[PDB]
From Swiss-Prot:
Keywords: Cell inner membrane, Cell membrane, FAD, Flavoprotein, Lipoprotein, Magnesium, Membrane, Metal-binding, Palmitate, Signal, Transferase. This is FAD:protein FMN transferase. It comes from Treponema pallidum (strain Nichols). The keyword Cell cycle does not apply. Disulfide bonds: none annotated. PANTHER family: FAD:PROTEIN FMN TRANSFERASE, THIAMINE BIOSYNTHESIS LIPOPROTEIN APBE. FAD binds at residues 92-94, 155, 161, 246-248. Mg(2+) binds at residues 158, 274, 278. It is a lipid-anchor. The gene is apbE. It is an enzyme of class 2 (transferase). One of its GO terms (molecular function) is transferase activity. It is found in: Cell inner membrane.
């Protein structure tokens, strides 16, 4: 049996999603797996999306301040993990920030900053501790979510791509695949090893925060690892000489003012890397380092505005600088 390399990519969940596979299985088996990957992404866009009016999440948000809503086990599990990271990060990551994000989401569309009293009012409706998850213990008991605070809105944008990458890895493994690179709008999962007959680590690129996105500034060699990066210049608009990016500091209600240009988290679960990258960007370097000591199975790489790069002990020897303007501190 010969090794063959496959890739497929589609526009879905508002971005470019690509999966690359190396396999010795019959091509028809790989094709079926990839068909299912992209069907999964279409289906889950309709479960998780905060943009669409017809999503499961949109329906849940429509019931804020009312009775508990039945959800599938998968959505319940994601919400549980999101609330876990909200608690651990002191709300730096907050999955109930929809009231505020929606004010800034219309700002992006109109290139305009939201009113101050409006933002202050919005922040009163973002207490994630008022998201109540309950699941009975008996056979076939339903999973439920209640949004106790009137007007509160879930927004899972900062954890959903991680969740989907993990679901895709589980699907690929179910199809007896063990070598893939999953890339959901830059949210990466490196499954197994690639092929050169030699097996090699995947070389995951991390962009210049101010780059045009084309070329990586750095590459990191990894196996069985997610790599997720949060940065200011990922998504922003400008008004009167000021840049407003998409990652909100829940204390201020404004885009976070932080001491790093990007943070990349390396974790065995992409769900976790995705939530932590957002939290760490909001928290800044020193507080991120404190948070990450609570997760010894995770590594991190910080790119500072002065182009210094600091990486934790578990990955620093795996980092190669490609753009010599950047310096890896050792
Ligand atoms: C199912 C799904 C469907 C999507 N559909 C569309 C679409 O139709 N059109 C489109 O343009 N984009 C779409 N997106 C992308 C969407 O805009 C997300 O906001 C984006 O994936 C997050 O970008 P990020 O990973 O770089 O940053 P992250 O840092 O991982 O997430 C930032 C996002 O999380 C929210 N957020 C901001 N601050 C915080 C905070 N402190 N804590 C927690 N959350 C915060 C906001 O939604 C923000 O956009 C979709 C994403 C998903 C997951
Ligand atoms: Mg994130
Ligand atoms: Mg993300
Ligand atoms: Na209010
Ligand atoms: Na800050």
């Amino acid at each position: 049996a010969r090794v063959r390399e496959y890739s497929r990519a589609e526009l879905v969940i508002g971005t470019l999603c690509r999966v690359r596979v190396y396999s010795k299985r019959p091509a028809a088996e790989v094709h079926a797996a990839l068909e299912e990957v992209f069907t999964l992404l279409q289906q889950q866009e309709m479960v998780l999306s905060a943009y669409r009016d017809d999503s499961a999440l949109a329906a849940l948000n429509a019931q804020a301040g009312s009775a508990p809503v039945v959800v599938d086990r998968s959505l319940y599990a994601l919400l549980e993990r999101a609330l876990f990271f909200a608690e651990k990060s002191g709300g730096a990551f907050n999955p109930a920030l929809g009231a505020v994000v929606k004010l800034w989401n219309i700002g992006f569309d109109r290139a305009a900053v939201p009113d101050p009293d409006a933002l202050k009012e919005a922040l009163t409706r973002c207490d994630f501790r008022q998201v109540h998850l309950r699941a009975g213990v008996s056979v076939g008991a339903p999973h439920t979510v209640q949004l106790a605070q009137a007007g509160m809105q879930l927004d899972l944008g900062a954890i959903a791509k991680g969740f989907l990458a993990d679901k895709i890895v589980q699907l690929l493994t179910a199809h007896a695949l063990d070598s893939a690179l999953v890339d959901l709008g830059g949210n990466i999962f490196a499954l197994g090893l690639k092929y050169g007959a030699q097996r090699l680590e995947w070389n995951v690129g991390i962009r210049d925060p101010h780059g045009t996105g084309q070329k990586p500034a750095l590459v990191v060699s990894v196996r069985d690892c997610s790599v997720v990066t949060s940065g200011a210049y990922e998504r922003f608009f400008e008004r009167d000489g000021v840049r407003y990016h998409h990652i909100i500091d829940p204390v201020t209600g404004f885009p976070a003012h932080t001491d790093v240009d990007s943070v990349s988290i390396f974790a065995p679960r992409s769900t976790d890397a995705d939530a932590l990258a957002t939290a760490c960007f909001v928290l800044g370097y020193e507080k991120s380092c404190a948070l990450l000591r609570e997760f010894p199975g995770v590594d991190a790489l910080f790119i500072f505005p002065d182009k210094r790069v600091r990486a934790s002990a578990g990955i620093v020897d795996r980092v190669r600088v490609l753009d010599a303007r950047f310096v890896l501190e050792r």
